[PDB]
């Protein structure tokens, strides 16, 4: 049953101990208040479940809470069932009172209301919509407000799942996509997103990737694309539904057309259709641009949108090797937005492909250039330090709430102020859960790009080559913008080399920003590091060292070398960072490689199993990326064969198969449509 | 409009004496007091020209990647003999094109124009020379343009290589005591293509013992139409025994039969039979 | 230079992709976002043209009011007879001009060209008709141009009007007993111009009694050269007595003297003498 | 003797009674302080003589003072002699102390210093240069400071004499132009002005006539021209001296050339020379204008100067009937100064002469748009009121200072707080001094354009026609700017009439400022008033009425009608306003009249005699305008004949002949050179 899985998750959540009763919700409101006063709320905060308990002996009330995404909230029904399951499943001391208050909070970023569902000790529930800007203000829930809230929770769950940097330790992610009828669940979610397309510019955007929110760049459009990635059988359905929306709601046509175009983007089967819809979308726009003298705010919205679509064409032409046409649109696109990073970037690509490297360098020069809530968690650092922030009363209270748990076993599962207990053990495998996972802990947040900050301090100190660390620190981390640029520089180096690049620099002086100078030097040092060989020297190298070497090799495009190092780093212990890079290179192989095989499906299946196990340990039961992998494997091997290959693996027990069978079941359901 | 003004101090003057103001700090420093400047300074024709380019490009893109594009022809080798070869292509695909011309090339267009490139996917190239390399390629003329690709190069077989002999078997006379099984085993020994029961473009030889009932034998009439040699089974045996393809006239169904005594088939070999 | 830019938002873009800023509030409202404008917007040739006009005007002014300008000729009436008139002009003034041509006009240029307009300020217009109005004018050709002005109109005298007779008096014979005083009184009675002692252009008649010593008389030789009638004093008396100008041939110094008895002068009148 | 006249004047000054001892000099300093703090000092205040006296009985010191112009101040010598004469000539009571302090103050507007010469009771003298901005500051007198002071006093004396609106009642004006050798005096004065030409822009300017000070418009250039008007025999000398200055001091050539050009302006004999010097002056300027990119402050100075010279050419061409050339310069001139009133004005004249009246009206539309010290004086108003502001102590003190004066006679000479005593009676004639002068009093200041404010209130009330008063009030007075415009409108009316002008107005709308609307209506009403006949109605009309009618007739260019009315107003009593207008029309006849005779020299001589007598009564012994008249009369009649005609007039006694002989003597001296 799909209910089976949900039940197990709801019973398997961690517990964070509130410092001061009330702090948790007071801080939530404060944080919302800030976001609203500042310019962008964005997605607002992740959903929270708060539990209020009474220690009988002392007169003291104490709280516990945890973070979660993926509960539906199309109305109170699903959150209430969840609260009901939580309360019914309690195991508590005689010293803990049976009066318990549970609150579920989900933030609606369309209305900027925090929806709080409160399940009382008398087992009755009340919902309030809190406007945090005007403190006292509570409203009543219209249908529209519920739909906005549903949409908020779904967008937030997709965006969060797909970016590890946004996940707090111990975050519980539910498989929002699962349901009674798989196909109907997915359709429900798709139609929800599509109907909300007109309000997409209110959905926040990632400013790493874009200056302003655009019809093309915003969280809603991103989440829709991410979801469609795992539901390819629903593409034709989706294009139709939008075709239908544009008929009922013609004033919003631009939004619906843009969604058609971005959904079909990068699907080779659908290129003729994409090109055709772009055509119908763009031509009207040049007209509508010249028919406003006001320069009304709608003028920037449209020019941005027009440039974003043109970018899509440019990219398409470039990928197909037609540089003359690419340069044609690429010109038009850079005029309409001089503020557009993407426009200059493609303009640089065009020049690079036409081998005119000075113009490219000019283009590059021309380009345009959060949450604190982790006090509760302490990293284990490979067993080299103790992580316990609890006081004795805090622990007494915690234990009272979890009677079924042996106290010493409980103490071992606490990391700082959070109890990382996972009771139903879904996803369990011995090698992962009883060894490597305990060491290291969840890998998420800004530090999650490598293991430098998760591993033994001694292990880092042991690294012979200082540059190896220095080029991989969280500070010197590249980031979307400079990463894209570094890429263009690599393209250039591949042709004429670093010395060549450097001459091009001074040719350009004849006809240079400091941030660019800094990249040249970074690039140089990375190329050097790339040449290094850690093998055959009768020198012992740690996993961390292999992993860092591999990340550098990816960066410099030495693919085989990178795969080799990354695998080597996994030999002595599991490395969630290296593993993910391996799966990613299988899922999305580099374009330059000539349909080369970097990894064989047996190796992939092995890694994929461990990764699913690692993810499940820390509550990620959603795993959109891993589904994408399973989907690719089912395409190659077939579903039944793939299942057998999984069953043949020695680490596989029943707990992990619950999870895998669910994911496989869902993928299978999608094949009939 | 385009109108020349003169400049005293940020105050500008017409030759009409009407005086237009402009910004003191925003005044172009190419200008000194008592210059003559000509304002207009803008152009509303250029926009039309730009709009024209935008659409030409959009139109080109649409045709090029938005329409149904006739695919390039794929040329394959069906079979190769000493004096001949049979070529075929994967079926033609034109999205919207009318097709005009399909043409074969070997070192140029001397090679002919396929009459029915649609209905018929093959051609036999007849006159050739033993053990000599050739090359062939297809060219496609469709409304939407001419595409072609993937020329191939093949070396005709020598006398001693029998791999290209493809036999279609006809009626055997039970009295003559030669069986289809014997012929097939023999064909296997010499490495020829397996035995057809039907006459195609690629059939080299029609093997036969029994003329009677010959009329109304569709295969025999096709064999004649295709100008394929009609030979007794002993011809295959002789090819095997002389380890090379041999003359066919001695084995015509009206030829003197004295030579057949020397090329009798051995009895069926069960090991080979059982194995396959 | 003249260079076309395109406009996104107050940011402007080259076809080179180099982006120039301009003022948000000072941006021309003929322009909407994504227009194409062409800046240059100024002209440094016009200044040269303007400088040229300034100087041409200054030069013209200087010549015209700054140089020495030849004045227009002034035409006056010296005397008028029945058949004739004498004209003069105030002396010519040319500041820098060479003078080329001076010319007389009456109803057009038929009138002649003065030979020495400088050395000689008069001319006599000879053939004419009694009691008939005429008009005359001068035209001046100088390097600096042609100026003329102030034409005049005069009516020749009738027979009975003696005001135009101007006598130059020569030698009187004491024996003949006619005195200069008598002649002058007579001239006064008839209203003629006072008596000259010297022959000029405007002299009508030379009055004389005594030929002897005639040679070496400069006045007599001038009178002859000028073709002036040389007459006895009794001619004047006869003009007075017949109340009109009369014939002169009867009074030539060689004419028959019978007629003189009839035109004797009365004795000098003292009242008139004393009065003047 | 020329000393004779000066002696008589110095003994003949009025006396103003100081309200509070010290007030007089404290207010002077204050007024200077203000002028300096405000933007333009201009000419600063007129010179003052202050007398300090001690009443013995009371312990009280009291002051007396008067205003004077025309004392030399090339150094202390002349002011000191004056103070010496004053003190030596005193007649005082036993009650007045013989200790007396005299101060002479002359303001130097080049350095902004007030030069005060103090003649002590011990008969010693000290000079101080007071900087009134920094109170305490006193300096010592350099030669340069004396020359600046000399120049200041001479410029101020010319400017004041020639504008009655600037003269306070009782101002004493000395004949600065008189001296031992007449020709040397005049030359001294001319060279002084010419050497100071480079500093002309520091000399103040009249802003009625010009927006900014220009090389052409400033008090120095005006005073030089005014002086040259009375010394025409010195023109050739002057042009030479400037020719010499330009050689010693070439960096100032622009100033010296401009002075040549303005001095020769409007002298028909000299037109060829003027045209030639303009030519040499202007051409270099177009170049020097285009050779500065800075637009440095020197750029406006030069452009203004360039436009001012061009204006002179334009005017010349127009007067000579050459409208094509006029329009040529007139164009160039209006470009170089768009701020120039004169430039638009000539541009309008050009159009009017070419009969294009709309352009003219456009031009007109385009055009760009003090001292309180009279508390001491009260007008007699034709004997209809008493004028006495003195207290009894004030009068006792005044009398003590003037022992030689019979007290009742003295009281009759006091007008408010000033004693209008003139002791030596220079200029006296019975009909003027013993009748009309006593009534009316001095006519000067802003009210001096007509007699409305000088005459009996009853006489004004008696005027039948309200418009007659209303169109002549000091408020509705025209003023230089609007007067010039009114003139152009008259030019237009003469051709097409007021109805025509009005159509031109609306044609122009097709292609109008309120100030212009107001002139149209004024013009209309003046034209109407012009038609009026005050004679033949068996209606008695006052002199005031005839005079007002005549002023209106001048305004509307009905010259003969105006002369007739003006003379009629003089029949019953002397009218200094009408008289001056008559003399002015003789001196400068209207251009339109065809060399017509408006007035015969006998009538002029009669009026001129009375005017000189009136002027002398109130201390104007300078009389630059009257000298101009005498000079014209000497040109027409010859000096000896003119003198006899003066002697033949019944009002002439010895006192007035002192004055007349001096003026005639001076003019005569100028004829040999």
JSON list of C-alpha atoms in Angstrom, two decimals, chain A residues 473-540:
[
{"chain": "A", "resi": 473, "resn": "UNK", "atom": "CA", "xyz": [36.69, 25.45, 0.10]},
{"chain": "A", "resi": 474, "resn": "UNK", "atom": "CA", "xyz": [33.13, 26.61, 0.60]},
{"chain": "A", "resi": 475, "resn": "UNK", "atom": "CA", "xyz": [34.31, 30.19, 0.14]},
{"chain": "A", "resi": 476, "resn": "UNK", "atom": "CA", "xyz": [36.19, 29.61, -3.13]},
{"chain": "A", "resi": 477, "resn": "UNK", "atom": "CA", "xyz": [33.21, 27.56, -4.32]},
{"chain": "A", "resi": 478, "resn": "UNK", "atom": "CA", "xyz": [32.27, 28.73, -7.82]},
{"chain": "A", "resi": 479, "resn": "UNK", "atom": "CA", "xyz": [28.54, 29.35, -7.86]},
{"chain": "A", "resi": 480, "resn": "UNK", "atom": "CA", "xyz": [26.18, 29.41, -10.79]},
{"chain": "A", "resi": 481, "resn": "UNK", "atom": "CA", "xyz": [27.33, 32.65, -12.40]},
{"chain": "A", "resi": 482, "resn": "UNK", "atom": "CA", "xyz": [31.11, 32.20, -12.22]},
{"chain": "A", "resi": 483, "resn": "UNK", "atom": "CA", "xyz": [30.75, 28.48, -12.93]},
{"chain": "A", "resi": 484, "resn": "UNK", "atom": "CA", "xyz": [29.12, 29.29, -16.26]},
{"chain": "A", "resi": 485, "resn": "UNK", "atom": "CA", "xyz": [31.92, 31.69, -17.07]},
{"chain": "A", "resi": 486, "resn": "UNK", "atom": "CA", "xyz": [34.62, 29.24, -15.98]},
{"chain": "A", "resi": 487, "resn": "UNK", "atom": "CA", "xyz": [33.03, 26.89, -18.48]},
{"chain": "A", "resi": 488, "resn": "UNK", "atom": "CA", "xyz": [33.41, 29.29, -21.38]},
{"chain": "A", "resi": 489, "resn": "UNK", "atom": "CA", "xyz": [37.04, 29.81, -20.39]},
{"chain": "A", "resi": 490, "resn": "UNK", "atom": "CA", "xyz": [37.51, 26.03, -20.43]},
{"chain": "A", "resi": 491, "resn": "UNK", "atom": "CA", "xyz": [35.98, 25.90, -23.93]},
{"chain": "A", "resi": 492, "resn": "UNK", "atom": "CA", "xyz": [38.60, 28.44, -25.01]},
{"chain": "A", "resi": 493, "resn": "UNK", "atom": "CA", "xyz": [41.49, 26.69, -23.24]},
{"chain": "A", "resi": 494, "resn": "UNK", "atom": "CA", "xyz": [40.59, 23.43, -24.98]},
{"chain": "A", "resi": 495, "resn": "UNK", "atom": "CA", "xyz": [41.25, 25.08, -28.35]},
{"chain": "A", "resi": 496, "resn": "UNK", "atom": "CA", "xyz": [44.18, 27.44, -27.74]},
{"chain": "A", "resi": 497, "resn": "UNK", "atom": "CA", "xyz": [45.30, 26.58, -24.19]},
{"chain": "A", "resi": 498, "resn": "UNK", "atom": "CA", "xyz": [45.79, 28.74, -21.09]},
{"chain": "A", "resi": 499, "resn": "UNK", "atom": "CA", "xyz": [48.66, 30.59, -22.71]},
{"chain": "A", "resi": 500, "resn": "UNK", "atom": "CA", "xyz": [46.36, 31.27, -25.64]},
{"chain": "A", "resi": 501, "resn": "UNK", "atom": "CA", "xyz": [43.55, 32.51, -23.43]},
{"chain": "A", "resi": 502, "resn": "UNK", "atom": "CA", "xyz": [46.05, 34.88, -21.80]},
{"chain": "A", "resi": 503, "resn": "UNK", "atom": "CA", "xyz": [47.14, 36.38, -25.14]},
{"chain": "A", "resi": 504, "resn": "UNK", "atom": "CA", "xyz": [43.48, 36.84, -26.07]},
{"chain": "A", "resi": 505, "resn": "UNK", "atom": "CA", "xyz": [43.18, 38.80, -22.84]},
{"chain": "A", "resi": 506, "resn": "UNK", "atom": "CA", "xyz": [45.80, 41.34, -23.92]},
{"chain": "A", "resi": 507, "resn": "UNK", "atom": "CA", "xyz": [44.57, 41.45, -27.52]},
{"chain": "A", "resi": 508, "resn": "UNK", "atom": "CA", "xyz": [41.28, 42.49, -25.97]},
{"chain": "A", "resi": 509, "resn": "UNK", "atom": "CA", "xyz": [42.96, 45.29, -23.99]},
{"chain": "A", "resi": 510, "resn": "UNK", "atom": "CA", "xyz": [43.92, 46.68, -27.37]},
{"chain": "A", "resi": 511, "resn": "UNK", "atom": "CA", "xyz": [40.32, 46.16, -28.48]},
{"chain": "A", "resi": 512, "resn": "UNK", "atom": "CA", "xyz": [39.28, 43.67, -17.87]},
{"chain": "A", "resi": 513, "resn": "UNK", "atom": "CA", "xyz": [37.48, 43.33, -14.54]},
{"chain": "A", "resi": 514, "resn": "UNK", "atom": "CA", "xyz": [39.22, 41.99, -11.45]},
{"chain": "A", "resi": 515, "resn": "UNK", "atom": "CA", "xyz": [36.68, 39.25, -10.86]},
{"chain": "A", "resi": 516, "resn": "UNK", "atom": "CA", "xyz": [37.78, 37.92, -14.24]},
{"chain": "A", "resi": 517, "resn": "UNK", "atom": "CA", "xyz": [41.49, 38.15, -13.37]},
{"chain": "A", "resi": 518, "resn": "UNK", "atom": "CA", "xyz": [40.67, 36.02, -10.33]},
{"chain": "A", "resi": 519, "resn": "UNK", "atom": "CA", "xyz": [39.05, 33.28, -12.49]},
{"chain": "A", "resi": 520, "resn": "UNK", "atom": "CA", "xyz": [42.04, 33.12, -14.83]},
{"chain": "A", "resi": 521, "resn": "UNK", "atom": "CA", "xyz": [44.25, 32.38, -11.84]},
{"chain": "A", "resi": 522, "resn": "UNK", "atom": "CA", "xyz": [41.75, 29.88, -10.42]},
{"chain": "A", "resi": 523, "resn": "UNK", "atom": "CA", "xyz": [41.48, 28.17, -13.80]},
{"chain": "A", "resi": 524, "resn": "UNK", "atom": "CA", "xyz": [45.28, 28.03, -14.00]},
{"chain": "A", "resi": 525, "resn": "UNK", "atom": "CA", "xyz": [45.64, 26.40, -10.60]},
{"chain": "A", "resi": 526, "resn": "UNK", "atom": "CA", "xyz": [42.84, 23.92, -11.36]},
{"chain": "A", "resi": 527, "resn": "UNK", "atom": "CA", "xyz": [44.46, 22.85, -14.62]},
{"chain": "A", "resi": 528, "resn": "UNK", "atom": "CA", "xyz": [47.68, 22.27, -12.65]},
{"chain": "A", "resi": 529, "resn": "UNK", "atom": "CA", "xyz": [45.89, 20.23, -9.98]},
{"chain": "A", "resi": 530, "resn": "UNK", "atom": "CA", "xyz": [44.32, 18.23, -12.78]},
{"chain": "A", "resi": 531, "resn": "UNK", "atom": "CA", "xyz": [47.69, 16.92, -13.92]},
{"chain": "A", "resi": 532, "resn": "UNK", "atom": "CA", "xyz": [48.38, 15.37, -10.53]},
{"chain": "A", "resi": 533, "resn": "UNK", "atom": "CA", "xyz": [48.40, 11.59, -10.13]},
{"chain": "A", "resi": 534, "resn": "UNK", "atom": "CA", "xyz": [47.70, 10.21, -6.67]},
{"chain": "A", "resi": 535, "resn": "UNK", "atom": "CA", "xyz": [48.44, 6.64, -7.66]},
{"chain": "A", "resi": 536, "resn": "UNK", "atom": "CA", "xyz": [51.58, 4.65, -8.22]},
{"chain": "A", "resi": 537, "resn": "UNK", "atom": "CA", "xyz": [53.61, 6.67, -5.77]},
{"chain": "A", "resi": 538, "resn": "UNK", "atom": "CA", "xyz": [53.50, 4.14, -2.96]},
{"chain": "A", "resi": 539, "resn": "UNK", "atom": "CA", "xyz": [51.82, 7.02, -1.21]},
{"chain": "A", "resi": 540, "resn": "UNK", "atom": "CA", "xyz": [48.64, 6.44, 0.74]}
]
